[model samples]
Target chain A: GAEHLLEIFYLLLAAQVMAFIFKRLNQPCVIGEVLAGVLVGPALLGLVHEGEILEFLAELGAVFLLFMVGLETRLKDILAVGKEAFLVAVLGVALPFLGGYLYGLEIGFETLPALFLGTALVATSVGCTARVLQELGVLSRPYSRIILGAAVIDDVLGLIVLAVVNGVAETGQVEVGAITRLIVLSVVFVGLAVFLSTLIARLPLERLPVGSPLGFALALGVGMAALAASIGLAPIVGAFLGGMLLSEVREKYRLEEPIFAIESFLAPIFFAMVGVRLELSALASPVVLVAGTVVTVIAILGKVLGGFLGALTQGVRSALTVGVGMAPRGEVGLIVAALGLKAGAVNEEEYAIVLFMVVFTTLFAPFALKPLIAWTERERAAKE
Target chain B: GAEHLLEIFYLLLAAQVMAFIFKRLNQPCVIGEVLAGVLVGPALLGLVHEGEILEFLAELGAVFLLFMVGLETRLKDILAVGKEAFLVAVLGVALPFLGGYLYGLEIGFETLPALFLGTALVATSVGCTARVLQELGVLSRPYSRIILGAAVIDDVLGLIVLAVVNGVAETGQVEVGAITRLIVLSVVFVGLAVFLSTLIARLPLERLPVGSPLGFALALGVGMAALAASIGLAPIVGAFLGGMLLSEVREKYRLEEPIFAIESFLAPIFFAMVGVRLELSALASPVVLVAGTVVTVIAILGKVLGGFLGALTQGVRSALTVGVGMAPRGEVGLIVAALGLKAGAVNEEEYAIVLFMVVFTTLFAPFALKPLIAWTERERAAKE
Candidate 1:
């Protein structure tokens, strides 16, 4: 128990220190946390070991992060661009998947292996892009809205791709029917949870006293998530859908308040624990290390290019900046890599390539984003 | 994963609902939470099954709660009442142990059984007392100060008693020499952590960025707790001591900010989870249930009476009010019971008694405290 506490403290401390450095360098704290894991994890300093406590904390961080993302998602926005989002999502799934598969095939990789690499790269991180846009103070801009809308679409698309890729990898053959069923079922589950929540929120929840509304809403949200999962939908997807539902309900005054509290507490533990879970030894090979760096660059460029190309109808400059701004692959990339690894569609080397890609994209996105956002806004201001 | 999310939601929802009800009736929310646990837990509605995810959440809650408690504890208070706290601590330990042991012996319980029973009863639940005092708006009063001081002492004394009792229970013989050595070593560990933290807090902490100080303080605090746990001391004790050390610095500058943020996030999860961990099956036995209720009443009365008696010199009306106000048993009581159970000093039956005592005290203290506080204040206003 004593050892566990110390391990947690040091892991957090290392993550914080790295975060502080990132802050000084004008980077997001997550980057520092991940880097901290790389440094102190088995591959580098080997100062901390993966323990039960650390693992739990990391999982908590992931859950909390997802929960927050769920809260931020606006249902109206999802509805407004529903068709485009769906199309973008479908295209997002097909393009990168094919790109990855063909790349793998060209390299003489197995069929499943080819599909995994592509699938992992497909999802665009809406939150990361939104953060960049918000930081640049352009989320309200038309171009920004379009980008944000598409990014959300990308997330849904990415999740579907993940579900499909994961399913195919598991069975060694694409189950088209099952994929369609899963998507349809998940959509229905989310819609129901949201619809019920909307009705419930119309009641005077504020007058209901402190914990009631918050508790009830949270319970419903979780129940829906569980039900979805029971029916073979992704738990995270359920959580996201639940969050989006809540986001649409404005009268549930304290709904998001408790979230801030819950997320803040659980997030650090999760992030630090993730840091603790890092195996530095995996990056020990100089060959893998350099290759990881190359993949990281590709991952960042791929997303930016995809988002930019997808948004080209908006305008050249706007689309270009938006694309660059969305360059960083955050949680989605990692999730895809994990799915690939879990499905045995990627070797350790390939998995590391994806991991490095995600990490690199995450690290560089914030930096790349700030400048592009600034430059784009300046141009907009000058034109005005 | 879906089930886990659902459980989390329900757990939070239950806690919130109970809190809301308790507050409407002008009572402490903690009581509501405990009741909520009973209702949704296996013993009542059976909405939640005791599972790893919930347990993990509960554990996180406990750690966060303790860390927050530590952050709140001021060093100056400890120093001001150091001698008295220690004296009261010794008395507190001796009286409870002797009282419980004698009672058990009179009932013809075995020697080991008598000792274990005594040790279990020796714990002081500061959270319960603190809650009552807060609800009554006398948390700053002298009686409150003394009770808080004594509770801290009680924690230390309780640990020693636990170690000794468990040692005796295991070996079938008392080892005075070993007990003394262990106590001394534990004290030294706490002393070192406290001393070091004070030294750190006093130097160069303020010069750092606004965020770092709080982050650093929390990291330091958790680190101290972790260090203590590593050296065979309880992590909570280490955390408490760390809080005291940090609290010594002037509050005006607000070094407590960062630590509080960290604490806030983790503690709720800890508590909600705790509520989940409770075995509803244990409450099934009508005999145990009745006994538990009776014991809980006694536990609350014991604190109230003890407080009333302790504050006799302060004033009659004030003493009575203050005494009754300190009746609830919150986290500390639960911790003692848990530790005793973990140490094998107490069996499941004995552990249940301790839990019952805590639950009972916590449940009724709010109901008892609020009205009494109003009456006393009313009378005091009339006199004035």
Candidate 2:
């Protein structure tokens, strides 16, 4: 137990140092945190080991990240982009699924692995794109708002695809009825959780002692996350809905600082764990490396084309910006890959390639997004 | 993974509901938290299990609790009460050791078990008493200051006794040289850690972005706790020293609010965990129950008399308040009992009795302290 704590100490120390350096270098601090994990985890110095405690901490990071994102997202803002977001999400998922599946088939993979590959490419990592937009001071911009809206929809649709794919792989037959039920269940759960949370938020929690409001909000978020997980959806989805439910109360109470304090400390651990799980040994195999690179490129292109097509009415620059913003697969992709791995539907090589795709897409989105957003802003300003 | 998270969600919810009820009842919120644990833990509904994640979270709670205590404690205030604290700690430890050992011998226990029983009685649970004092708004008072100072010293001395007892139990002979090395090492480690932390605190960390300073402080606290644990001392010692080292900086930076947010969320987990570990079945045996009650009464009396005698110069009332404040055994007692159980020096019955004593003393201190403090205040007001 003590040794495990010692490892956490080293991980946090390494993360801090890397975050500081990366901040100085004008890169996202999360990238540094991830690199720190790679340096300390099994891939390098081996100072930290993967364990239940670490995983729980990392999961909290994701939960908090999503909650924060939800806090910033207004219901009306999401509604305003509903049509565009739906289009973006559908297209973004479809092209990626097709590209990945075709690539798998071309490479002589079985149907289940091909479908798993396709499913893994369906989700966008809101965390990666959201953080980048926030850092660039464009999170509130129109294109970024559309990306956020689409990402939420992306999560729901991607989860549905994951459920469907897993169902097919498990029993070797398509279960349309089960898939439809899961999709409806996930949607209903999020809706009910949010509705109930809004009522809870209106209660006189603010009259309590100093930390009670934050504590209640955190508990609500975690509880909702648990609810979502129990219903076979991502916990982050529930956490997001929980935050959105509290967003109105937050506007009145100003409980953001305390919540932000926890998020900042934990979110780095989540990002770092992502890097820690990356196995560089997979890159040494020629076939895996070549196929991974091919799939990664296709994954990016598929999402870009899909998002661009979906948002075409918003203008070429805005569509390009939204497309690039939605390109990163992040933890959503990892979850799909993990599910496939556990179900014996995806091979070790395929899993590694999917993880590689996730890392690359995650890293690529921010760099690709910064310039696209900047160029879009510059073009709009010059025209004005 | 998801199940573990669900357990945490349920725990937080139960703790919150219980705490609210306790708050309305005007009792210690921590007591409610502990009871909540018993309600949900193995002793009752069994909604949660003791696992690596929960253990780590509970440890964090203790670490943060001490760090917050350290923040409240000033070096000068502690120094002012140094002599009284030293006397109180020494007498407090010595009397308990003698009393417990004699009781064990009277019952025909072997040398090692007797020694372990004695050693178990030597430590004070600063977290328990500190929280109570903090709640009562007497933490800054001279009596509380002395209790805090004496507790710190008590921890060090208690740890030394624990090391020595374990050494004797393992080898069947006392190693005076090993005992000396442990004492020196622990003191030196704490001293060096505090000195280094003081230097780090002086650096310009406050100018960083919103949450960096608090993040840095938390990392420092955890790192120090790991350091202490690596050296076979309680992690709370390092956490306490870490807090003290940062106490000066806290005055300048006012970083307490963010730290408090985390502490408020986590500290309840630690307190509840104490209650969760309690086994009510152990109290079934009349012989064991009577002996346990006798031991507990002696434990309380020993600490009270020791503290009262040491603070006699402060006046009768103040001395009484100090004595009551120092009476709780809390986690220190639990740790000692666990150590003995692991070393085969404490049987199931002895362990249960020690646990009973710990719980009783912990519950007793808050109730005993409130009226004494009120009386002292009333007397002082009349004198003025």
Candidate 3:
């Protein structure tokens, strides 16, 4: 028990120190948190290893981070960007999937492995961009809204993509009926959450059988997260929807205090896990290192180009911010990469390269976006 | 991942529902949480099992509960009751130790088993009583302060008793130097915490390299908790000292918001885990049932008598309040019982009996204390 506690202590300590230094240097603190994970993780000090408990906490960390972001958003904000978000999500999926797929084929990988690689790259870590925007207090900016909206949509699309790949790998053909059913169920899930919450949440929580609104909402959020996972989507997506469902109740009940408290306690663990799971040992193999670099560049460019095209009308500055913001694939990519390796669909080298792409892309987003975000702010203010 | 989330969901759901019903009936809510654990745990629903992740969270649940209690207290408040708390703790430990020890021998157990049983009975669940006191808003009352202070001391005394028992079981006799070393180290740990906090906390945290007083303090608390465990003390005791160490800095930096937030989120999990781990399946055998009931009776009476004797000068009502408040052995007893069973010192029946005692004593406290607290309040007001 003490051993576990010390690992957590070390994690928080490393995260805190790195985050502090990053803040001093005017960069996203999440970057430093990720670095802290590297330092404490198996890649370095090896002070903390991935355990079942830590993995659960890491998922929760992301779930709460998304939930908090959802608390900040109203349904109306998302609906307002619905069209732009869909287009952004579509382009975002297409570019990354195609790039990774073609690159895999060129490297002589089999169809299933190539398809899985493509599937892995389809989702973006909204947490990466959401954190950056939140750090800069720019969630309301037009492009920032699109990034959040698109990433949520991208998560659903990514799940569908993963399912098709899994189906193909297992059965050699995609089942339209199954895919169609999944899409319908997902739509119903999101719609029902919104509809149900509107009716249920309008009532006072104190007057309900569940006394503590904080307890009820948190449980509800977790239920949704689990439900999301059952449907093959990320739990954080479900958690985000959970937050949005109760978004109306947040202000009325002052839920932000507890929500923020839970988020602050857990989200650092998520960011650090990204770095902890990142094994740079893959870079030691020369062929893997070169190919890994190639995949990494393609991964970065695909999202930047996708965001750029989707936000073409939002002006170059905002488009670049959106592009860079959506670049980090984060844990979602790692999930897919790990899935492929365990399924024997990819070799260790391919798995390593995919992980490198995920980690590097995750690491690249903030540093590149910081300057772009700064430029957009300055440029926008000058024109106004 | 989703499975784990669902388990947590079930736990919180059960806890919230029970707590609500209990509160409506004008009872202490923590009782409901423990019952919720029983309802959802192995004894009943079997919806959630004791997994590694859940176990870790359970420990954290206790840690945060004590830490929150610590934040509410200042150093001076505990010191004021130093002598009274010490006597209460000594009486509390001795009566139970002697009662359980002698009874074990009478019941045909050997010396090692008897000694282990005694050791297990030494500690109290400060959390169970603390939660009750906090719920009734009587934490500042004379007896409540003594209960809290005594429980903290009882935790330390319990560790020493466990050490001696462990040593005797492992080797043949107790080592004076080892025991003395422990005492000196423990005293120094406590003294150093108080002294160090006075100097260290006077400085502003915002200017420190490790920013976010919340992160810093939590890591520090966890560190201290880990350190405490390394010395064979319960982590909650360490967490309490950690909290008391920063009691002076709490209000100065407004750390209560996050502290309360963390506590509110995790403490229920701890309470419920107590119930979840309570295996009533132990009560089915007639011999086991009869022995369990007897031991439970002795366990309850021991603490009540100890509290009563220690607070003999406080008047019957207040003394009884302290007595009843000191009764729930909680996770501490379970820890010890599990230890002995694994070590072959206790058989399944004996271990189950000990668990039964722990669970029943835990279940008994709130129901018993509510009325006593009420009567004392009314009588004191009427006489005054």
Best by DockQ: 3
lDDT of each: 0.62, 0.77, 0.78
CAPRI verdict (incorrect, acceptable, medium, high) for model 3: medium
Model 1 scores a TM of: 0.85
TM-score of chain A of each: 0.84, 0.86, 0.83
Ordered from best to worst TM-score, the candidate numbers read 2, 3, 1
Q: What residue pairs clash in candidate 3, if any at all?
A: none
Report the candidate with higher DockQ, 1 versus 2: 1
lDDT of 2 at B157: 79
lDDT of 2 by residue, A61-106 (tens): 8788778867766665688877888898889888999988988999
How far is each candidate from the true structure, as Cα RMSD in Å? 4.2, 3.6, 3.9
Error of 1 at B382 (Å): 6.7
lDDT of 3 by residue, B1-384 (tens): 677788899998888899889878765545687779889998899888887778778778878877886666666678888688888888988898988889888878887898888888887887677777877898878988888889877876776677567656666666677667767877788789778767756677777678588888888888888888788765766787888778888887778887887788887787677667666755477787887788778888888888988887668879989888898887566557655664577766676677667767776887798899999999899886
User: Lowest-lDDT window of 10 residues in candidate 1 chain A?
Assistant: A271-280
Instruction: Give the per-residue lDDT digits (tens) of candidate 2, residues B231-343.
Output: 76667656877787788778676578788877877887776665676566754667778888998888888987898888787888799888888888776666677567756
Best by lDDT: 3
Q: Order the candidate numbers by lDDT, best to worst.
A: 3, 2, 1
**What is the TM-score of each predicted model, taking all chains together?**
0.85, 0.89, 0.86
- What is candidate 1's lDDT per residue for B26-131, written digit by digit as tens? 6654556666776777666777777654654555456666666665677666676555445445555665566567665664567777776666667776766676
Better of 2 and 3 by TM-score: 2
Which candidate tops TM-score?
2
